Amino acid sequence: SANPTNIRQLKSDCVSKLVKIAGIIVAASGISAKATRMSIQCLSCSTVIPNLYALKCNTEQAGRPKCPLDPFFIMPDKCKCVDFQTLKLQELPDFVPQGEIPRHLQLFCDRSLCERVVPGNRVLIQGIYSIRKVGKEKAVVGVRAPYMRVVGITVDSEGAGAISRYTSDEEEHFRRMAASGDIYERLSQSLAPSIFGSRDIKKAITCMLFGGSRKRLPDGLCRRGDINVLLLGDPGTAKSQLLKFVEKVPIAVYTSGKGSSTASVMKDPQTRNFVMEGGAMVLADGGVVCIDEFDKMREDDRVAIHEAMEQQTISIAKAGITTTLNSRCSVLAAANSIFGRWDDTKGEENIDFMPTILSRFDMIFIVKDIHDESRDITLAKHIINVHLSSNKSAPSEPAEGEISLSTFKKYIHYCRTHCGPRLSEAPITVRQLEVIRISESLAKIRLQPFATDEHVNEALRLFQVSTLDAAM
Amino acid sequence: EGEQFIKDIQREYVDFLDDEEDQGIYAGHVKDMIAEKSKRLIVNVNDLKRKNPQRALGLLSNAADEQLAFGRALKEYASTVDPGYAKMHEDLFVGFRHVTPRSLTSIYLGNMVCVEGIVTKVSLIRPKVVRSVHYCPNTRKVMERKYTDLTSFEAVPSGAAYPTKDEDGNLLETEYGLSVYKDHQTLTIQEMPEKAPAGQLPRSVDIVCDDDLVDRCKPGDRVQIVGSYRCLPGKRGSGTFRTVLLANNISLLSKESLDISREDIMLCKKLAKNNDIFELLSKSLAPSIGHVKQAILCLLLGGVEKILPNGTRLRGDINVLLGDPSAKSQLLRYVLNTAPRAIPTTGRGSSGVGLTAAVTTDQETGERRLEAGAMVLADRGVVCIDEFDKMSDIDRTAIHEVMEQGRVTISKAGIHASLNARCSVLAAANPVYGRYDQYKTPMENIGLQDSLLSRFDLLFVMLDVIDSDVDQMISDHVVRMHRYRNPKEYEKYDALLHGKSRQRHEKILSVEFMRKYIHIAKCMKPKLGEQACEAIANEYSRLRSQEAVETDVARTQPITARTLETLIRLSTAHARARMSKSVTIDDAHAAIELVQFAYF
Amino acid sequence: SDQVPVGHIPRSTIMCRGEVTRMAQPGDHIVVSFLPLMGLLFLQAHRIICINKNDEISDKDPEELEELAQDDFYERLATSLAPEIYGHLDVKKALLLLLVGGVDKRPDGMKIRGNINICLMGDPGVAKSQLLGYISRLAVRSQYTTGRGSSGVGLTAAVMDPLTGEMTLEGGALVLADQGVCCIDEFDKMADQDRTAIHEVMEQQTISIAKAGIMTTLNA
DNA sequence: ATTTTTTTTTTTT
Ligand SMILES: Nc1ncnc2c1ncn2[C@@H]1O[C@H](COP(=O)(O)OP(=O)(O)OP(=O)(O)O)[C@@H](O)[C@H]1O
Ligand SMILES: Nc1ncnc2c1ncn2[C@@H]1O[C@H](COP(=O)(O)OP(=O)(O)O)[C@@H](O)[C@H]1O
Ligand SMILES: Nc1ncnc2c1ncn2[C@@H]1O[C@H](COP(=O)(O)OP(=O)(O)O)[C@@H](O)[C@H]1O
């Protein structure tokens, strides 16, 4: 390969029988080694084995001499060879894994079927109902252990998830829509397909994901083409759901504090190895992240913030070495930091360790729960339509061109691979300017090569939202 | 003697050893009379494909047994030519498709193929022994029994303890100095991780090495390494299967070698008379940068060493950093990338400056971690870090130690050790009130400690104002940056003019031409003449007398004579920027303007 | 550690039987004059020569008579003790007195402190680092600690945490320097709690450690 | 020798 089964029903009754069942994969081993046959000096006969004991000497018949007690020294250069993975999976998420605990199965791959399956997947398979030990203070009488084999996996590829692992009409859709000079501020009602606010700040997302340019030089540098954002304010503004709903909108994760981080220099079960998992500059090298609670997180993993945002000057020393990995990462930031707009407009006391956090980023526009009585009742009843009735799946689908997740993500992931765009001849200090990334951005926002200073000082006029926070 | 094809294999290999390839290129007085004894006469498979392609495959299809025969051919030849390179009748291996460590699928067994990856878990040395050289003090006959293992051949002896009482029960005893032995090594390989897939956990590999192949590098480096396969043990008659790949030669790739014969020294000698190359040489660390760098010259050049006869020596190095925020975290990079193995570090971290404290609370093996220092790799190297204003006061002590001595001396139960280091290091900055530098006070607008006057080696200035006259100047240079950044001044071509009104050329303005005068530059010893002492003494007198007055006394904290070491050993680094076997009044002039830029 | 590669770590086995025993101490710079030990995966010696720290180079462990008849002087020591600096005859000669020694009595059951214990405070261009280093070099059975540094803290031994289980009193510099000098630098910055450690050790031969439940002496 | 733990000291603003 028809029709499935479950796991809570299968025992001696159905042993050595081939079955269809389904779960969700967890993790498993690499591929090591196997063979079937070779031969030995002692007899020089092929190592004919049925299954995938240990023997008479036969280095004997030299007249009388015997040599019993097994001098069988394998000569593996004579050998054959097969594969393995040794796999594992967990049973279903719907068949009481809650009041019970989840049981599972151990597996055996053979030749061609590894490098095929990574966990986070849902499969249908056939196997074999076999065990591994022999019998009758373990095993008070005779207890034994479960496993199965591999035979005839058939996986699920469920529909619209998988531009993850596995047209020119759509390019017409890309470009002949792109010809419209109505995308920069048009989509200020787009990234919140269910929310109001952030409108002219969605104006500044339009440059964000498209990126700037890593215009390296004949001398050393690889300077910060990447760009980041900061936002700040109290709860109630739905800034959680702003990042939660943004997860689906290129590659990202949304958790904050005490619950990845750094490396995994620990061991596994298999002949006690030590092999790593990397960081998440690993998982973000063109992908970017949206992450709250800088302040409400452990102070350990904060040397790797300046060691990535400023330079990408990353290094390790756990074992005696500097795995010096790097990545093209950037971040959106959120917070519920100390005392809102009463703090923001006035001077600089938010974080009690560094003023550094205003330097490396530019667009910091405040989150408030401003009282505006004309809208306070609206936001008092902007929350009963949300609270009720489960209707709003694709209400934004009818919009001219502020929807279609797939086409938009692909819009971008072509766009961020066009050329080396630039601009034209054309407290406003050095890191306001070093905005120039947004200048070059509008080349790729209009999908052009070039652009000018002050048509594209749209960004300047939007940054004036932020600078009023910390001008004074 | 197997099947007699082995002999024609030997002869087909030896048919390489006759004519202009052999007579002109290959061995003899190309290795042997240069007196090296490093057996390995380097092979390239493509010749084997060219002469005997079937024998270009005899390797790749059965690598169990081409090998004693290769050795036979070699020892026969060299014995035929040189009985001097002839008294070491051993195996004598030689040099000789790259898939991943993720891409070994049951096969390549028997094949001598390439895989790439990282060094990790470089381990201990062991001998391994070849024969047993027995002698019978009754009958007094030096007899022998070779040993073997699969790791060289298929053949293995009754590999066991020394034999005895087997011949007769006679007077039977070993001897040493005769039963030779083999250098054995073990480690494992990881892929280069930048490729790595996010969904899976990458595989390692395991390898074995041998005699002349012992570890010219370290766990956590990357080199191309080629190997055959075997697999010795059983599989469940016993216990399941596990393998390794082996039979190797060596490379190393991520270095510089350097098409450098004695011509390149001729080049460094060619531009020598050009006097103020200092100019370009200082414009060789700021093309994308005002300001300084002529001062960073010496920290690039390390320092100088000088010793008393029948006495001891001096630590030699230079370390400086200073201002206002927003070029500091994108300036240091210039020296992470260019000058050999100069390693920045975290700025706020430990488990890697110098500290061990036997931290094995996981696996708990034999070794008790006696090495977690990344500042002794700065031995004769260079370092920079951030967080100095945020630095722990744990190490300010330790740096007081270093700057005075430059050696570590720890005895926390691992061992009472001490280890050379000849290092330098840089820093960060954060004054807790910003734009206060002198009007309020010169010193301690900064959030700092003042034990460290003489322990760094210059006081300088770094300041800022967005302006009125420099407003449009900032505008136009930022733009000239932004388009001299850019081509014609792909995705981005070459930008020249305003490096053309500047009459240089990037093959006189270049990296290899830059370090043209490093590697011999860092090997000179240009002693002093007859002139420094006088003026330096008068002017250090004037320094120590009148630099502490007239509205700059508060910016005149570091006066010591420990500067006078620095005041002169900088002109040393300068004196090894031109190979002049002296130092001069002109070097005097050029080695005071430090003083002027500090405030003047 | 004078031949260990920059990018390497000093590695360390010696088996001697018979009469040769007791011919070296922990921490002697020695010369020693190969046999493996039964996958086919130590050393026996005969002699322990040390050009430094050995019987004729060490003090108290005639030969000079031809020159001793020629040499009768007290001041030339300063001329040859640390020529590295001009002037400062007094500080050198004061230390030469500490190099001198030869003062002791054991009357009535009690001893008398018969070693010179000098202290120095001051910090300009003084360069009092070359002196301590000079003394610590030439002084037979010498030592060096700093104000704090690491694994020592310019002190003796302590049972100071959650690491494992040993109760290794770990004798440091102040422990081991006896019959000699432990030359600390920047004692002022050492620690307030530490001053009591120099208090009971001042008198002589006395460092008690009643922390683990033992009468430790260490004979300072 | 490691896995599953707990306090009693070691040294404190
Ligand atoms: N004279 C100059 N030459 C080159 N670049 C400059 C100059 N003046 C300002 N700049 C630019 O201004 C930017 C200032 O931010 P920068 O990255 O230097 O922070 P930083 O100085 O690294 O902070 P710190 O030094 O405290 O770590 C630099 O990227 C630099 O390119
Ligand atoms: N304009 C709005 N539309 C819909 N829901 C809103 C709106 N304003 C506030 N909310 C409510 O805010 C809640 C989420 O607050 P949250 O984003 O979790 O605060 P924080 O981000 O600090 O955690 C949601 O349950 C939602 O009902
Ligand atoms: N009288 C002197 N003779 C020779 N060198 C001196 C003299 N005074 C100072 N020095 C210099 O002092 C430096 C050592 O200073 P140092 O003693 O380390 O200062 P500190 O004692 O404060 O640590 C030496 O490099 C040396 O050149």
Side-chain angles (χ1 to χ4, degrees), chain A residues 223-224 306 310-311 356 359-360 430-431, chain B residues 286-291 321-322 324-332 386 389 427-430 462 477-478 481:
Chain A
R223 69 201 198 289
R224 312 183 28 68
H306 226 58
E310 226 349 312
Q311 309 67 228
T356 63
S359 295
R360 298 75 161 97
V430 302
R431 249 146 185 194
Chain B
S288 44
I289 266 107
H291 314 140
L321 183 141
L322 296 72
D324 58 43
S326 305
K328 254 200 264 103
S329 295
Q330 253 312 333
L331 169 58
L332 81 173
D386 203 90
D389 49 280
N430 184 339
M462 292 161 78
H477 180 273
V478 170
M481 152 171 70

Side-chain angles (χ1 to χ4, degrees), chain A residues 61-128 130-147 149-259 262-289 291-328 330-364:
Chain A
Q61 299 85 10
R64 181 272 313 171
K66 64 192 160 58
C67 45
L69 319 190
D70 312 327
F72 296 119
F73 204 80
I74 280 62
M75 311 311 177
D77 303 336
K78 314 186 188 140
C79 84
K80 318 212 175 138
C81 34
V82 194
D83 289 337
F84 265 125
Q85 177 155 334
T86 312
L87 329 139
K88 162 97 188 194
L89 172 155
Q90 206 173 234
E91 67 91 9
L92 289 171
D94 308 339
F95 286 60
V96 199
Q98 60 98 358
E100 313 311 312
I101 56 173
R103 62 176 81 179
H104 57 73
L105 71 172
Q106 191 71 93
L107 311 177
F108 270 99
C109 206
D110 305 64
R111 315 193 206 289
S112 64
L113 282 95
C114 14
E115 309 113 2
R116 152 98 67 193
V117 63
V118 178
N121 192 31
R122 77 183 65 74
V123 310
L124 297 102
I125 21 168
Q126 327 295 107
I128 208 88
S130 67
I131 66 174
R132 57 187 324 295
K133 284 278 172 55
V134 43
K136 294 222 302 195
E137 298 195 349
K138 316 175 194 177
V140 67
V141 175
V143 79
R144 277 210 284 288
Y147 85 74
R149 177 187 173 89
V150 168
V151 177
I153 176 153
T154 70
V155 316
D156 310 293
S157 66
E158 290 291 332
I163 300 286
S164 77
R165 179 60 178 163
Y166 176 77
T167 73
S168 180
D169 188 318
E170 308 299 342
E171 298 189 2
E172 168 57 12
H173 280 69
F174 272 16
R175 219 202 316 275
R176 178 258 298 171
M177 289 175 211
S180 165
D182 311 313
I183 283 297
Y184 183 91
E185 314 90 324
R186 201 86 201 172
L187 284 85
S188 165
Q189 293 177 335
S190 72
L191 283 136
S194 62
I195 319 92
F196 176 88
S198 295
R199 297 197 302 174
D200 298 326
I201 300 80
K202 266 91 162 172
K203 200 203 285 158
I205 276 158
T206 299
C207 50
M208 188 187 165
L209 303 70
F210 296 3
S213 295
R214 183 166 273 206
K215 302 302 195 104
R216 299 156 286 184
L217 317 173
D219 273 334
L221 57 78
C222 168
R223 69 201 198 289
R224 312 183 28 68
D226 308 330
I227 82 183
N228 288 43
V229 205
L230 265 284
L231 67 99
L232 171 148
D234 75 302
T237 76
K239 72 161 126 70
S240 295
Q241 290 77 28
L242 276 194
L243 310 174
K244 210 279 185 174
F245 217 60
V246 122
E247 182 52 15
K248 312 309 202 321
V249 192
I251 17 171
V253 290
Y254 63 108
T255 16
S256 281
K258 287 74 68 180
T262 79
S264 178
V265 201
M266 49 79 83
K267 89 154 173 188
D268 24 306
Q270 300 88 233
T271 56
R272 277 79 77 183
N273 289 337
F274 290 79
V275 315
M276 55 171 280
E277 288 282 8
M281 288 183 62
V282 178
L283 260 161
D285 195 343
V288 306
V289 274
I291 68 183
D292 219 302
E293 315 183 348
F294 294 91
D295 269 317
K296 278 61 59 170
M297 192 163 62
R298 54 210 175 277
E299 275 299 320
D300 310 278
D301 52 6
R302 294 177 73 99
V303 182
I305 52 167
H306 226 58
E307 297 282 25
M309 293 70 101
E310 226 349 312
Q311 309 67 228
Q312 321 277 35
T313 39
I314 170 62
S315 64
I316 294 169
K318 191 275 164 190
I321 52 187
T322 59
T323 299
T324 298
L325 70 75
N326 79 5
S327 295
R328 290 84 169 117
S330 62
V331 193
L332 214 172
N336 294 31
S337 182
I338 56 179
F339 265 47
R341 191 174 222 176
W342 186 353
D343 169 275
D344 299 356
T345 320
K346 322 311 180 198
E348 43 167 359
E349 55 277 43
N350 216 232
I351 199 159
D352 300 12
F353 281 58
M354 50 296 282
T356 63
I357 299 301
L358 312 92
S359 295
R360 298 75 161 97
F361 327 94
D362 205 65
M363 286 175 207
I364 318 95

Side-chain angles (χ1 to χ4, degrees), chain C residues 7-14 16-102 104-118 120-166 168-177 179-181 183-189 191-200 202-211:
Chain C
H8 259 99
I9 60 190
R11 293 182 183 174
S12 166
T13 302
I14 271 298
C16 50
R17 41 174 201 84
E19 306 270 332
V20 175
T21 59
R22 317 143 70 238
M23 290 190 78
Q25 262 178 5
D28 311 7
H29 178 215
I30 99 197
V31 173
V32 184
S33 170
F34 217 168
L35 69 147
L37 188 171
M38 294 300 293
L40 295 174
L41 286 67
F42 81 109
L43 191 83
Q44 293 177 335
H46 313 276
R47 208 83 231 124
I48 294 89
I49 335 183
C50 314
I51 187 75
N52 289 337
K53 301 175 219 280
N54 249 26
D55 180 277
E56 264 317 288
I57 303 301
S58 45
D59 289 345
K60 286 311 306 204
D61 283 278
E63 293 177 350
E64 295 85 357
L65 83 172
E66 293 177 350
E67 293 177 350
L68 177 63
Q70 293 177 335
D71 301 295
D72 184 1
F73 271 104
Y74 12 89
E75 293 177 350
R76 293 182 183 174
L77 286 299
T79 333
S80 186
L81 174 44
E84 308 81 57
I85 290 85
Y86 88 96
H88 320 98
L89 281 65
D90 56 72
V91 210
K92 306 172 184 177
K93 202 151 187 184
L95 307 194
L96 177 63
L97 295 174
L98 188 147
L99 295 174
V100 157
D104 253 357
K105 189 89 6 172
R106 207 267 173 187
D108 319 334
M110 162 52 190
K111 202 49 189 63
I112 293 89
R113 190 160 106 290
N115 280 15
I116 324 301
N117 182 0
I118 310 177
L120 295 174
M121 46 83 32
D123 63 347
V126 72
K128 16 130 184 68
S129 296
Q130 189 267 328
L131 273 65
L132 286 74
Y134 202 85
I135 290 310
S136 42
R137 184 83 71 249
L138 188 147
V140 289
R141 207 36 199 96
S142 158
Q143 187 66 177
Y144 201 115
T145 355
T146 190
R148 167 98 169 66
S150 97
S151 64
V153 184
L155 237 52
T156 154
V159 189
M160 181 176 195
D161 284 305
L163 167 92
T164 24
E166 245 167 39
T168 36
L169 49 55
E170 196 263 324
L174 224 302
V175 125
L176 54 89
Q179 274 265 16
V181 58
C183 317
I184 278 180
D185 206 347
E186 288 90 9
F187 154 80
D188 184 1
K189 318 317 188 187
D192 289 345
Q193 64 180 51
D194 268 12
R195 86 229 143 182
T196 348
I198 321 284
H199 160 91
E200 139 97 358
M202 245 3 165
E203 293 177 350
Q204 186 173 355
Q205 200 209 189
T206 59
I207 289 152
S208 169
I209 287 275
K211 293 182 74 42

Side-chain angles (χ1 to χ4, degrees), chain B residues 126-129 308 312 371 376 379 400 404 410-412 418, chain C residues 1 6 9 39-41 84 129 137 149-151 163 170 186:
Chain B
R126 297 294 102 194
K128 216 183 283 195
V129 175
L308 296 175
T312 70
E371 71 281 75
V376 312
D379 172 47
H400 183 64
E404 280 302 82
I410 62 159
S411 178
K412 192 30 61 169
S418 171
Chain C
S1 88
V6 262
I9 60 190
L40 295 174
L41 286 67
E84 308 81 57
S129 296
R137 184 83 71 249
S150 97
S151 64
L163 167 92
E170 196 263 324
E186 288 90 9

